[model samples]
Target: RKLTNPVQLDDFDGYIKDMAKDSDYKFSLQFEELKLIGLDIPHFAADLPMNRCKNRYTNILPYDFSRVRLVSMNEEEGSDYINANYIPGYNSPQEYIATQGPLPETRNDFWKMVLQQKSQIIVMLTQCNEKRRVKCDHYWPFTEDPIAYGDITVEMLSEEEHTDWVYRNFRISYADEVQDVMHFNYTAWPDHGVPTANAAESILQFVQMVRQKSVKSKGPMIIHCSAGVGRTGTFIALDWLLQHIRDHEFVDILGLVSDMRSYRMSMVQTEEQYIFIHQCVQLMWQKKK
Candidate 1:
């Protein structure tokens, strides 16, 4: 489908309301649409030179055009490769980054990427271990003392706990130019599906906080969840939509996902996640009314 963007909000609003009314039938259309919006962005550096072990999932890898390149951080660091992509938003270029959870092997590289990227906000959606499955490596220090990722020093300062999320502050110094970075982790999401019941509201609030907070930092926000496709794509979809919905009265759910796929393969990775985007956008527009 040559899906045109900036679709009429009036048409979309009515269609969105209609879709919610019959979700069982309507959501599959989107799922099929996503499947049909297939991407063939190739993978090269993700595999060569034994970097396969560095990837969290064997199948998921950053594409060549969109992947972020790193400078040599350490003597042993051969590949300046990190499984991250520079993802753009509606009005921002390389506005946000979609990356995999830090691996135990890549923990130092991950923190160094933070320092090098100069990103202000890091939004993590998965826990290190979920349902007894180790999803990501525990890359942060819980102690008050500082941890070093090569030249960068990261000090775990504080965290504000919420019902479904936590806002953490870290004091980072790249050779005495100390700057504070924010880490926002959403604990409410599960490995299978999204939050249940009124949790959509909670999810909206969570997105709102990130949206509000990103302004405080001039650099792009870092958003990651597991493979950085499904939940990560979903959060980024919501973030962009929330911003787009306010600025204009039009949206193209189909086209946006297609664009994101071009940046990184298989964004909005699940049919359920694609539907969740619809649900959240519908909820957001409804609440506005």
Candidate 2:
């Protein structure tokens, strides 16, 4: 049964009431429905032996969204090694790069992809260490010192700290071109738990900054969490919904999420994560209106 235009953003409260009428407004049933729908989407496996060497997990692979290569330095002739996907934006193609945390062996590979994509903004959603666990390797430069990865040299020029995130400016020189880049490390997001409503404003502020910077340049914004699926997916989903709502005053959460998973599987990893995305959107919508 195709319901007509399911919910109207102009009447979000009324839409909430309509949803409440179903199963007494419980979201668990809805969450399961989403999982099932995701099951129907084809999981394109671009897995190769070399990819296994670099990827943290052997299961995740970037879906060939264009049904063609998106231009990465593939270690194998036919496969990408970094466990990354060229996630398209709501407004444009190849607007975001989503990948896993870099390993020591693949740190140079990570920088290569960043430069290949010409990304100026990077959103690191995971911390280096969490609960005595090593979630991500330190791939960037330290203490204003320069680190060379292949042909590129990354030098941190300045650092600014915020309550929940840190902003670092870097000068990346490769060949004869020098590009200034921005790295936003969201340190407050927990490893297993979702971010609370209180953190949504700060996250939104970071998104705004990225948006302003990307408008002047034309390249994808690189984003990664641990395995590049859960937190990374949630962050991208929030940005997508926020952008669409601002442009059209309406959004289809299911449609948006399904679109994301089409590029990379297991996105919005847990049902709790799915719910957290809605919470952030609701809060942002309130602020917008």
Candidate 3:
């Protein structure tokens, strides 16, 4: 659906009133249409005292893309990551939203800017691997207001098992369409050699899925493994640079790593993974024209 104009507050058309399939999971999905209005990131940040804000200290929220709306929350029941700093419990809708004073004011403002500017909106979540602690706030002016009941429209998934690209795709497909096909060429490196038949085919299938999305959507392709920066970086970096060359666009090498820190709290958490991406890029490019 081409949402190009400023969405009026009254046009809650197709607004799923009770979008939750599970009552225990009080999460609802809604799209904050970004058509008109431009919000200043700095001012938005300033409104919420940085010191009072937990995001700055815990990295619960990474970077905010004004165009994107956060419709979900990774909830928990303790002082742990999911419990303390994020939205309320899955079943606790009122409490969850009450935590944030303004209903959808901030989120709506952010999306308004995105649509007006036609920017690539990347949803920044407090994500990690260890899986124990993680928290995120549904702060608007960056993300949208979480609905109280039902509110789901379209959902997509990329079954890239090797890296769980499906999970990534599902996350982004929530906002926009993907615009480019994802690809990765392998060189006959001795240590890595060719991936196992299963791995190669699975990853290739993922590439195909990415290709399909590219033709069908405009969301960014997300590649991440355990640490994300290591091998994950390699594939994303290679794919990004290659696409840049093919499209004749000057791509910033480091920009490919914008999310590396968010993934593991630090770029190249493991030296091995860091070197792997570097080597993978060089090796793949060696064969490129």
Candidate 4:
């Protein structure tokens, strides 16, 4: 029945009252109040709240970084054994700082291409240019179309004002209000060097920051780290598994990783990182199951 717009409260009440003579209505109370005869049910609630873990969810779908087309270096040429691209995002000295920093110029051309294609949600991940401090750089030529730029470095939440990220990088903070936000100092990851406790901390910080933003946005979250896939893969997989098991779901471990890397490049940080996930999953499954 198509109802007319702007119905008055009195009209609604009278309509319901008129219908009530021929219909039945009831209300519900405590579950204990309606026990089925000869049947038993537990009165207490489970340890996990309904919907408590609903928000604990993560999308099992893989990331499409290739669709975004990453341009980053492998340890400034880290390991040929592992395959990944490396680009500094700039070739000139002056233009290099503005090109890589969050200011609109760094991404103007790319954004223009994205706009021409009419793409939505341009995902970005960038490594801090270890060689440059871009705090006071200019990106003027890019101003021809200001909105075309999509700076990915701006996404990471960081604190230390001493870094270029604070001095000049112009990406929107996770929020205007939250301060001292968590971030991974990518330089510490040491792409050319072996993974260390420092790398773990950086990876861990990135995971936690994304989890926080996931709640804040109550929407899709983008995970990124320098060179696009390596740490980005690890961070995404770790968070995905942690979030799933945290909700008490026993997900297929290998499938979880394959799902991420199939599209996003090699996910699940490293062989060691993969093993760590298996152990974590085993521990989680044993505890509450």
Which prediction has the highest lDDT against the true structure? 1
* Model 2 agreement with the true structure over 148-232: per-residue lDDT tens digits: 9767899999988888889899888878888878899988774446556565667777766766676744678888988888989
- Give the lDDT ranking, best first: 1, 2, 4, 3
Off by over 4 Å in 1: 4-7, 17-26, 36-38, 73-78, 190-196, 283-289
- In order of appearance, the predictions have TM-scores of 0.90, 0.85, 0.33, 0.39
Each model's total of backbone clashes = 0, 0, 20, 7
Instruction: Give the TM-score (vs. native) of candidate 2.
Output: 0.85
Q: Which runs of model 4 end up more than 4 angstroms from their true locations?
A: 1-106, 109-126, 130-187, 190-202, 249-251, 268-273, 276-289
Tell me the spans in candidate 2 whose CA falls farther than 4 Å from its real position: 1-6, 14-26, 36-46, 65-80, 190-195, 283-289
Ordered from best to worst TM-score, the candidate numbers read 1, 2, 4, 3
* Whole-model Cα lDDT of every candidate shown, in order: 0.79, 0.72, 0.28, 0.32
Model 1 accuracy (lDDT, Cα): 0.79
Off by over 4 Å in 3: 1-57, 60-150, 153-212, 219-236, 245-272, 282-289
On a 0 to 1 TM-score scale, where does candidate 3 land against the true structure? 0.33
Worst 10 residues of 4 by lDDT: 90-99
- Candidate 1 minimal-lDDT segment of 10 residues: 190-199
